[PDB]
Ligand binder design. Structure first.
Ligand SMILES: *[C]C1=C([C])[C]=[C@@]23C(=[C]1)N([C][C]([O])[C]([O])[C]([O])[C]OP([O])(=O)OP([O])(=O)O[C][C]1O[C](N4[C]=NC5=C4N=[C]N=C5[N])[C]([O])[C]1[O])C1=NC(=O)[N]C(=O)C1=N2/C3=[C]\[C]=[N+](/[C])[C]1[C][C]C2=C1[C]=C([O])[C]=[C]2
Ligand SMILES: *Cc1cc2c(cc1C)nc1c(=O)[nH]c(=O)nc-1n2C[C@H](O)[C@H](O)[C@H](O)COP(=O)(O)OP(=O)(O)OC[C@H]1O[C@@H](n2cnc3c(N)ncnc32)[C@H](O)[C@@H]1O
Lengths: 499, 494
């Protein structure tokens, strides 16, 4: 009934927030709408898979908060398989390679690819992580979709097709759906194109032994019966002395403060008294989540390793159900599996099919890409379509359509009286990830602690020690990469030796 | 407790739907979240204004359904003032004119303007009203914003500025915010550029004597205590034999069917069991409403008419708080007033000011455009910012960002088991208006009537007799307008 802080939502952010508050001796209640904690992380367990992450899963270098927190909860990581060759499948052929970036031979194409990625990071450098609307050209970059930007920047179809896959993969949305400013912010705040795309030394280096769902499950264990499941919040009243929070089943909770730790658009499921301020009122109708089906096909053995393939497939073009895969085999080498994402419009389109129909399409795709009939012989299949989740709205995260981030960005984490905002969307380093979930949860908790006089303002935002288990190598660029001209820069140079 | 149909929302669409069902002998309950009916229409009454429409207001030729319905409720229209000259204010100077289109004098510019509007209507011709996503170039047109389209089409800055003002005014959103396909559909479904922009012979011809709020009020009057106010729906359960609808104050309603007659995105304020299908689930997080403050400044007299101005100002450029105005004086010639809209990003920006600060900016603006010190002497001011409305989400209506209408358009009025969808957003003629609200409410009601076996399939969509009080003259184009080349068409000819 009465406590210090009600935390709305028990995903990683809500739980990290509750934990920090509880570790400070405050009385917290977590109101979780679902019959489970974890939210957009969700580890399934059964005999066939032992365990499998059907939601968020990968962690890696620079993601120190999720790594620290999981470690304290007694969790361990292992390295995603990347020993053997990666594959880029383009125009129906596979080209095996090594290193994070699919290589390119043609010198003109090479110059355009190089400049594309370089320019993403160049542009990124002008974008404050904590205030992207302050970039010098914020409006100009916000009033254009990623599709316009790629049209402008890519002088080859090849660079454009790969850049498109990259956007689709990073943010489970189409290039024409999303703002260029927001997309560029998003990548920059993960440390740039290399850090974000890499398995070794990047965001996909590792997974947790046993599944990421353990993070929220273990904090639930620690909080005992402070975590209330099947308590969807429907109503928040801030007109009186104490904040009142009512759940759908009719329970009523009183607190000094509230943490909203749910996706920004899911705030729409709460009726507010007094009404939200105008800007948040509209903000929450303007920030949708992406579309993805996570798909895991199981095999007797990891046969691809025998062909010197690690299981990483970068798959170009419209006909492919899945554009990207990673080896999902257990660290002991059993429950051999290929993980793949069905992205954006493909999530929407292929959802009309049955589970067995999608499994067939993936197997046939993988058999072609790996050149292996063994791909046609799955032993099991698990998949989750996150578009269908009432209390997620999609996955991995919230994207910003053109014009929104400069108009409404400021509002995202601005307190509304005694409501403070956690949730990975409000993070400034790896927002969209489990990492940002922890950052934003602990920052919101601390904001409340500051409101209560327990900590000074300087302690709201707090840095994090580098994980000793997963250290970060720095990101390096060669001299040519840095200085080779772009395609139009080459044209202008050829033009100059004619005049 | 138990009835035949729960109608969620008491705005024009909800009320039209409830009325039709009641007139058929069914038992309806309207659950309205606010302490009043009307929704995006809202007539304020006080001594100073007598009455004033602070939400939806204008009606005109071809809007036969709202006209028929209002007439039946005993309501009358009068003509918006357009006797004297209109003003176009461009680069800080007023150029008075007659007719609906501001004239353009430079030859090259004239060609570019002409082609821009013409091309809007040409493009619209390939867009089915009931299925815009079936336009032959739907994906191409949907994956680009109106800003890209204008950049492509407008060879002059003047045509581009005016076309931008046009979009901002039509849909209370920025050209870079909205899909080209959706916006082109939107205009086409109101009958094209001329019909949609015109006062005489178009959407802005008329207002209702006493306020448009009376439409919903008078229906609520007819339904008595069937209309429940301050009943925000929070929950809809379709797992059992009858549909269960719970309101925030804890009441529970049972019905055979439900009509959702609220803005598509406001569906998010309802928890559903079972969950909505995947497509609707994500659809409702992708369809925001625009941004507008409606602002009405009152004067002792309609002084503008003395200078042979009617009160219509078309005002170009960033610095102007308001891009468009209309005379809001009562038909009797008193409560003289000028109505203007603060649109899109300007609604966002100027909301930071106080009421009195916005009043000042608006009087100074009107003093410049009208060339009158009299504009600086207002006797009263009413305004409403719809962005702040929890149970609207904005005004006038729902816009579609790039990519959404083709992926999710089909889903808008698709029934979800026993939930049918009204609301102006689901209409196919004057969607976004009071007209489309009636069309959509009456169609949804008839869909339920069909599901019940009372009427055949062919009766779900029903045409409407032309109003005798407000007849439509047809839209005409001259021979030159139809055949003059574009600016690149002229270049290719040279
Ligand atoms: C706001 C506005 C303004 C300011 C203006 C205007 C408008 C608006 N409009 C629109 C109208 O109004 C609309 O459409 C209608 O109203 C709609 O209806 P419906 O569909 O029915 O809807 P609503 O109303 O919203 O209702 C709903 C209801 O529900 C409820 N809820 C919610 N949620 C809930 C509930 N309940 C229970 N539960 C839950 N949960 C709410 O509350 C409500 O009630 C318009 N229209 C017309 O027609 N007219 C007019 O005038 C209008 N307006 C505008 C206009 C403008 N204009 C025209 C302009 C000028 C010049 C120009 C233009 C445009 C163009 O195009 C060009 C030029
Ligand atoms: C879905 C997904 C996510 C994902 C990804 C792949 C997929 C398919 N891969 C990731 C990865 O490999 N590495 C990574 O770091 N992140 C990855 N992501 C995203 C990641 O899962 C999310 O960023 C993270 O889980 C975010 O967590 P957060 O705590 O910030 O938010 P949430 O998980 O959605 O939790 C919100 C909880 O709130 C509940 N809820 C919703 N509405 C209510 C109401 N009204 N009342 C009470 N509770 C509510 C939800 O049930 C949820 O539990």
């Amino acid at each position: 009934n009465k406590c210090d802080v009600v935390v709305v939502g028990g995903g990683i952010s809500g739980m990290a927030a509750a934990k920090l508050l509880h570790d400070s001796g405050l009385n917290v209640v977590v109101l979780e709408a679902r019959d489970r904690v974890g939210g957009r992380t969700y580890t399934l367990r059964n005999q066939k898979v032992k365990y499998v992450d059907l939601g968020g899963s990968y962690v890696g270098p620079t993601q120190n908060r999720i790594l620290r927190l999981a470690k304290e909860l007694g969790l361990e990581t292992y390295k995603v398989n990347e020993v053997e060759r990666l594959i880029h499948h383009v125009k129906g052929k596979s080209y095996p390679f090594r290193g994070p970036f699919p290589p390119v031979w043609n010198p003109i194409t090479y110059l355009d690819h190089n400049n594309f990625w370089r320019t993403m990071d160049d542009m990124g450098r002008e974008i404050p992580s904590d205030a992207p609307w302050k970039a010098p050209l914020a409006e100009e970059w916000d009033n254009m979709t990623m599709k316009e930007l790629l049209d402008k920047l890519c002088w080859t179809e090849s660079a454009k097709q790969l850049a498109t896959l990259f956007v689709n993969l990073c943010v489970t949305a189409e290039t024409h759906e999303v703002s260029a400013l927001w997309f560029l912010w998003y990548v920059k705040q993960c440390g740039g194109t290399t850090r974000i795309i890499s398995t070794t030394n990047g965001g996909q280096e590792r997974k947790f032994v046993g599944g990421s769902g353990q993070v929220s499950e273990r904090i639930m264990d620690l909080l005992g019966d402070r975590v209330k499941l099947e308590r969807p919040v429907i109503y928040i009243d801030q007109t009186r002395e104490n904040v009142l929070v009512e759940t759908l089943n009719h329970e009523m909770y009183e607190a000094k403060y509230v943490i909203s730790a749910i996706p920004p658009t899911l705030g729409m499921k709460i009726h507010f008294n007094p009404p939200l301020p105008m800007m948040r009122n509209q903000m929450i109708t303007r920030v949708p989540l992406g579309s993805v089906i996570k798909c895991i096909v199981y095999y007797k053995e990891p046969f691809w390793r025998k062909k010197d393939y690690c299981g990483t497939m970068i798959i170009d073009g419209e006909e492919a159900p899945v554009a990207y895969t990673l080896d999902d085999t257990k660290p002991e080498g059993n429950y051999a599996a290929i993980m793949g994402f069905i992205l954006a419009h493909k999530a929407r389109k292929l959802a009309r099919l049955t589970k067995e129909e999608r499994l067939k399409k993936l197997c046939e795709l993988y058999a072609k890409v790996l050149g292996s009939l063994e791909a046609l012989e799955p032993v099991h299949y698990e998949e989750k379509n996150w578009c269908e989740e009432q209390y997620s709205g999609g996955c991995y995260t919230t994207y910003f359509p053109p014009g929104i981030l400069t108009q409404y960005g400021r509002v995202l984490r601005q307190p509304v009286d005694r409501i403070y905002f956690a949730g990975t969307e409000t993070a400034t380093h790896w927002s969209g990830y489990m990492e940002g979930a922890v950052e934003a949860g602990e920052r919101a908790a601390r904001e409340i602690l500051h409101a209560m006089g327990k900590i000074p303002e300087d302690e709201i935002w707090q840095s994090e020690p580098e994980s000793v288990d997963v250290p970060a190598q720095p990101i390096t660029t060669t001299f040519l990469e840095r200085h080779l001209p772009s395609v139009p820069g080459l044209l202008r140079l050829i033009g100059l030796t004619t005049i």
